[PDB]
Amino acid sequence: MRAVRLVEIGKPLSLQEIGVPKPKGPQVLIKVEAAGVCHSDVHMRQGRFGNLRIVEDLGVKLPVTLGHEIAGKIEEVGDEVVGYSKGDLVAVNPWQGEGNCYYCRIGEEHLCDSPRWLGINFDGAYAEYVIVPHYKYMYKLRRLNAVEAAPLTCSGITTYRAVRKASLDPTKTLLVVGAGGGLGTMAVQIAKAVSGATIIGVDVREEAVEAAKRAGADYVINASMQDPLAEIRRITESKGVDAVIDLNYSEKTLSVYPKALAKQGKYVMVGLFGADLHYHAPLITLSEIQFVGSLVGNQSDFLGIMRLAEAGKVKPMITKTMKLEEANEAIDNLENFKAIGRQVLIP
Amino acid sequence: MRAVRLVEIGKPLSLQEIGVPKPKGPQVLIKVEAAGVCHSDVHMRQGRFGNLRIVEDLGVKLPVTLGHEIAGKIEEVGDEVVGYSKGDLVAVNPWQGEGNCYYCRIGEEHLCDSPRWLGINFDGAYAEYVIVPHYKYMYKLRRLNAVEAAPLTCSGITTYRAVRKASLDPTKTLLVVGAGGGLGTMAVQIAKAVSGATIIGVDVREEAVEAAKRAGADYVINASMQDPLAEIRRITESKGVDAVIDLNYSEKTLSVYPKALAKQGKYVMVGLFGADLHYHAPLITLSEIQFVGSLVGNQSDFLGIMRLAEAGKVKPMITKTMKLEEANEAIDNLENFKAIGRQVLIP
Amino acid sequence: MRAVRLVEIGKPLSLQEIGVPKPKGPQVLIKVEAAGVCHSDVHMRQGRFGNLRIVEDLGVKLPVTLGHEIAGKIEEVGDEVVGYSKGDLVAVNPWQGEGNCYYCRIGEEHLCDSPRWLGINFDGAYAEYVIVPHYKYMYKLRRLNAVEAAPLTCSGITTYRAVRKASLDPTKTLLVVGAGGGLGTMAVQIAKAVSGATIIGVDVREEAVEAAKRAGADYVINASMQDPLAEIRRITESKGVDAVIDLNYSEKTLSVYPKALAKQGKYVMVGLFGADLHYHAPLITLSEIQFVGSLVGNQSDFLGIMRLAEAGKVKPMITKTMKLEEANEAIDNLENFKAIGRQVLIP
Amino acid sequence: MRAVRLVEIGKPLSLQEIGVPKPKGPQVLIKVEAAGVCHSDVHMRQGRFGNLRIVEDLGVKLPVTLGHEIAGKIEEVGDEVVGYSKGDLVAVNPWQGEGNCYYCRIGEEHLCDSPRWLGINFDGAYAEYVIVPHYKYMYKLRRLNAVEAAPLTCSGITTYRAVRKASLDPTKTLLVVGAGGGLGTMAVQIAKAVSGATIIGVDVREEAVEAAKRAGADYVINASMQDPLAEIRRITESKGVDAVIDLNYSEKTLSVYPKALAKQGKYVMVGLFGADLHYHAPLITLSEIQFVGSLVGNQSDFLGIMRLAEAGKVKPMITKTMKLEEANEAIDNLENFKAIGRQVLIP
Ligand SMILES: [Zn+2]
Ligand SMILES: [Zn+2]
Ligand SMILES: [Zn+2]
Ligand SMILES: [Zn+2]
Ligand SMILES: [Zn+2]
Ligand SMILES: [Zn+2]
Ligand SMILES: [Zn+2]
Ligand SMILES: [Zn+2]
């Protein structure tokens, strides 16, 4: 089968012709119908994941097939597989744990001590087929097609968990920063579907502000036009917001938005940008605010976003389909921030 | 009555002879049998509270009587007081809310938008009598005397809430920083009394290390003689700790102890020291750590620490009793870090 | 002023001409614009409340003006009232506590040991004016008029708390029993506005099933046509539901719907009907199900329902307006189950 | 190897000579050094487990080796086992899941839809060797030996979870019913080690009342000699208890102790006795009480109890060692309630 792989850091991905693994035991062989490409793969093609080394830290033994956003049809099931048959359309949770460590035992497998992340330190979906280590990481699609689902396994689970960490309820207000981008609109949609909280989206372009409104925000702010802190204060009648979700935070967002926090406000940071949080400690204790990080999500988060998306309660990302051969191209566009829409590789 | 009051910023407290207020409605006049003095009174005699101005921010109309650590016998009760009688020995929760704002409605009264903090922006216990705005803020002492209880209304409630925010259970490990000082040993005792978590105490002098161990720590570390991070790494088998309670944090502690956090770990900061939190953002997202602030506590936290103490499950702070007149003196020793043990004024 | 009061048990309410109280301190005098009437008032005109005696248990000193569903305009404010002004239209939370008991301290005021329930053991809104003990129990109306808001102070808060007790999230499914009734549709609307859970509504007539569908149920079951437990199994792929909300339970609902629960499922029961819960203990332990009671709610619950309603996120109850003098008739209609919609008296 | 097995329902267990399975993949073959025996095995020797049929319900293809309380040294590890070596002394969590169902995904593996319960529907520890389906279900013993640890896999995890379900804190009071039996003293110790709550222990013979007191109960009551309800109301000053943990409830306990519940009290039921819960529904709603079932526990509960025990924070159950050959004998003893102390078979 054809597979686009990381054979050497720095160097572009390489198309190879490798053997189609044979599924044994709980394993499932999936014929890939969609392989999402995201910013992570930009930093992945450079041998890193945030600031770790896939080789030194995650134990990657190059070459490795990339692609951690996976949906497709079951081609074959191992002999121990239960509850799935050839022909089933599924999405796959790639953030897999080994089972024995503390995080696996308490059901937070994505924080596993020795992670098995598909497409990061194990072969992924940039190929005609992909082995899923255990059938329990799958979700049968009934309403969504593969292209619609694949991005949910990464951006969907990430934003779903970030919304959960914002601890929202009907008495609260949420601020979503960068609310008109891919991640932002998804966070707005999920917060709207799952919380009852008032949702405020802030962005910096008229088009992105409109996308935030279309995604369901109750209020939107164009920070290039209005002082955002003053508009947040006006909307919340000087209370501030009870949570901020800052997806792909930057040095700028971290310096501005914590000031919009109400007492006990939670500032949820998502992403891997090389920026530092700088905050006056007394301001933290006096207001009991919290700064909390989030990345990807666990099996319950996967269940949650998949259930929302399958019920149509949240919508698929704006998508651009491309062929496998275009993998490097797709990633280049993400480097030059020339990727308008989630790129998904299709057969 | 006699009353030591902050009549002018900078200038030392003044011993005045003002009248004894008359208790009306749900108010309660307490004859002070113990007024604690703590570090906050040092930064108080300087017209501030962390970085605010009791006058401009907390609306303090000087002169204002200090003393937010209160315990005494009821002298007289308003006509709407129920369940308390003249003579009753009580401790008082000074962190009072007005009831109408968001924070009062959800039961977080200490975070009230228009706080009524006894001894901070309302007349405190640095006097012979003190008015408690509402009887519900009192707790009937049965086992403890005024001197032992008075510190609990500040240090006890503060550390009780900090332990709750650590979100501890038996599967977890807590690090208490400064574990051998006044606040540190209380935190250790409370954590040992209420969570079942493994408790590590760290301090910098052999004497403080012994006090932490005597307060119940499972493991104690002397950071002057050992590398706390290496010790913690082995105690937790490289996982790190699930919470750090940093009472009276500094630029130094904030720069060291966050590195001890396990994934999902909570760094609970308590106090008003002029230090800034500096932390690389990707470290926060990758490990899902949380920096959480905490100060004083609500009516539930007061009930909790008083119940523990009355049942002897947590012991009174080490105290040195003095006279009302020695107020300015008491606050001096705190300024010059010459005060060993909680100073308690006895009118 | 005119006031319809319970001057004797059994005997029908009595229209009296009493004096308009004077508001002092934190008290607020409201000019009633809407006094909701509900089933509770049936069991109230009979000196009871579930199984208690308002006189013996709640300390009711007859005569007492009924009316616990209250909205109107501020006529006058006590001298200590802050944040409200004459002419403000407000809804009132009647489930008030005294503040000192355990439940009040932990923020569960409706479960107070010495409750101050307006319209129950204190003068309520079946009159031209009503005294609210403390202004903090009010909520300013902007979107809603008094008639729309009054029922929310009872059915709204009750149902909102029931939904919170069901512990819903996007990975779960809820069953609302009697989903087409006034309380049932409110529960469906709230669950849809606040949770992300999949919602199944069940009722027993075609028109009721339609009402549940309009309220927002994802699935509906006509139990007069299909076996409801089998249909719930089909919908949930044999898992059962993670919660049941059974508002105004009967002997019939309690004998059938707990069987629909998934493992760990919560059966939230609301109401005072004289029925017994009857269930085989081993089934409870084997499935870890929970039976949980709920009645009315606290300040946070009131905040939540008013915020949803004021934002239009949940709709007001179908209402029939009547005159104060018709109070007895209104209650009669509830006894003869000839009441269509929530009856609201307008003085 | 020697293996006592349930070859036919009704008929007593049969000592057989079966081969020692070979551990493949993630499996681990353990050399049993302790096989606890508890009441469940009595109810098991009768093909049942509460009321089910291990064959019909749990898919038990007889003969099946009993023994769900497992501890011993690792004889051999599969080729996929990490973190454990031949020679390691371990305790085993028998309440295992398959991974794919909702309950496994959310980390509640004991509630798995297709449970793999060692000693119940999978071969247990009544043998010289036993296969563990996956190494993650193990815990390395450091301070405990096999005999001390094996019972924890059942009574320890069960009571640990019951205590968590009681939702305790320092402001609360817990009643443990059957407080002086093996399960009861474990529950008391755990509540004392992990909750801060005041503990009332009730039992029905003086020797058991004394054992409850030695286990940590603050108050103890002999329900044989004194009205337990009057005594509880005296101790709690009429508030009632905030939780009851009813270990091996009976028709008697369930008809009595719910009456001792405070408002919001949680009644935690543990066990499989043939009794019905009968309770007036209005009492449930008026007081917001909860009846909640609890059975065994999940991976996090197992981690918690093993941590407590390995730290000496709770003590091993009183045990009586016997030989594999006496399996039927031990179960007989439990049938005739002639068994004093947890019987542990040592092949
Ligand atoms: Zn991705
Ligand atoms: Zn792991
Ligand atoms: Zn203090
Ligand atoms: Zn307030
Ligand atoms: Zn009502
Ligand atoms: Zn109360
Ligand atoms: Zn057992
Ligand atoms: Zn399962």
Swiss-Prot record, chains A, B, C, D:
Keyword Cell cycle applies: no
Record GO terms (molecular function): alcohol dehydrogenase (NAD+) activity; zinc ion binding
Coiled coil regions, renumbered to chain: none
UniProt binding sites for Zn(2+) 2: E98, C101, C104, C112
Transmembrane segments: none
Disulfide bonds: none
Metal-binding recorded as keyword: yes
UniProt entry keywords in alphabetical sequence: Metal-binding, Methylation, NAD, Oxidoreductase, Zinc
InterPro entries listed in its UniProt record: ADH-like_C, ADH-like_N, ADH_Zn_CS, GroES-like_sf, NAD(P)-bd_dom_sf, PKS_ER
Binding site for Zn(2+) 1: C38, H68, C154
Cofactor: Zn(2+)
Cofactor, free-text remark: Binds 2 Zn(2+) ions per subunit.
Subunit details: Homodimer and homotetramer.
UniProt similarity note: Belongs to the zinc-containing alcohol dehydrogenase family.
PANTHER family, per database record: ALCOHOL DEHYDROGENASE 1-RELATED, VACUOLAR PROTEIN SORTING-ASSOCIATED PROTEIN 11
The protein's name in its UniProt record: NAD-dependent alcohol dehydrogenase
